[PDB]
């Protein structure tokens, strides 16, 4: 069976709850309902995928188009009409927005409880993402800080046959040009890719901004539900479960 690393630690929902100082419940069912609703409406779908790591402005919240960030957004294909997203920026926004819907708090507050990049805060925009009290940030820092439960899979087939995945889990595709599994994710790389699982436990389905057609294809890109395709040609997988499974 699949061995869970950091087995005595915390699930993603629990970690977010802690980061929020118990202001956000991060309930699995509500997150799943949010995913169903916001994959179907016109808030995210259709937002251009753009090659700026800090892009986090979906069609429904085109916020970076109305601050100094607009210049960087425009260079890489962001638009005033539909905004623009990159992969981590999308997952950050989706989680933050879900927490805002659940709690009634403004997304500007809930985004502070969700990891993104350790350099997003230093960029100097109006919104901030999670950081440690010491000022570090990003996904592997979050995993280590909260001792997050995680799984590693060398193949997509192993992941999808493991019985571990639930809708709402976070999946990282780890660029096989820099490493395998979690160790690979700790290494700076061109093409690690993140998304939110939307399948039934065995189906190949996730919600992401990035490749929608094939592993390694960065021409055919968008913000949508699609199979789990990496930005890299070769991938292994890290799963950060949202909550304990049924």
What range does the domain containing 57 cover?
Answer: 1-246
Instruction: Identify the CA nearest to 174 among candidates 163, 157, 189, 159.
Output: 189
Nearest to 165 by CA among 9, 12, 15: 12
User: Reduced to 3 DSSP states, what percent helix, strand and coil does the chain have, rounded to the nearest 5?
Assistant: 30, 15, 50
User: What is the C-alpha separation between 22 and 199, in angstroms, rounded?
Assistant: 29
- Report d(CA 243, CA 174) in Å as an integer: 22
Per the structure, how many domains does the chain have? Answer: 1
Give the torsion sign (CA, 26, 30, 33, 39): negative
Task: Give the pairing type, strands 170-175 and 235-240.
Answer: antiparallel
Q: Three-state SS across 191-224? A: CCEEEEECCCCCCCCEEEEEECCCCCCCCCEEEE
Q: What technique determined this structure?
A: X-ray
């Amino acid at each position: 069976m699949a061995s869970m690393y950091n087995s005595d630690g915390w699930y993603m929902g629990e970690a977010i709850n802690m980061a929020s100082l118990n202001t956000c419940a991060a309930d699995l069912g509500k997150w799943q309902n949010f995913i169903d609703d916001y994959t179907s409406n016109d808030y995210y779908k259709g937002t251009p995928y753009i090659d700026w790591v800090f892009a986090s402005s979906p069609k429904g919240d085109r916020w970076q188009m109305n601050e100094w960030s607009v210049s960087e957004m425009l260079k890489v294909g962001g638009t005033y009409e539909e905004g623009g997203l990159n992969c981590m920026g999308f997952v950050w926004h989706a989680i933050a927005k879900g927490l805002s819907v659940e709690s009634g708090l403004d997304i500007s507050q809930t985004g502070q409880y969700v990891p993104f990049s350790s350099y997003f805060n230093g960029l100097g925009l109006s919104r901030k993402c999670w950081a440690t009290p010491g000022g570090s940030g990003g996904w592997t820092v979050f995993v280590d800080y909260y001792n997050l439960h995680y799984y590693e899979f060398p193949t997509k087939e192993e992941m999808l046959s493991s019985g571990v995945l639930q809708k709402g889990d976070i999946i990282w595709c780890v660029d096989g040009s820099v490493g395998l599994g979690m160790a690979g994710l700790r290494t700076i790389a061109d093409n690690h890719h993140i998304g939110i699982y939307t399948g039934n436990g065995t189906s190949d389905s996730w919600w992401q901004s990035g490749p929608v057609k094939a592993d390694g294809d960065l021409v055919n890109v968008g913000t949508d539900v699609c199979p789990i395709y990496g930005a890299a040609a070769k991938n292994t997988y890290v799963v950060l479960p949202w909550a304990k499974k049924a």
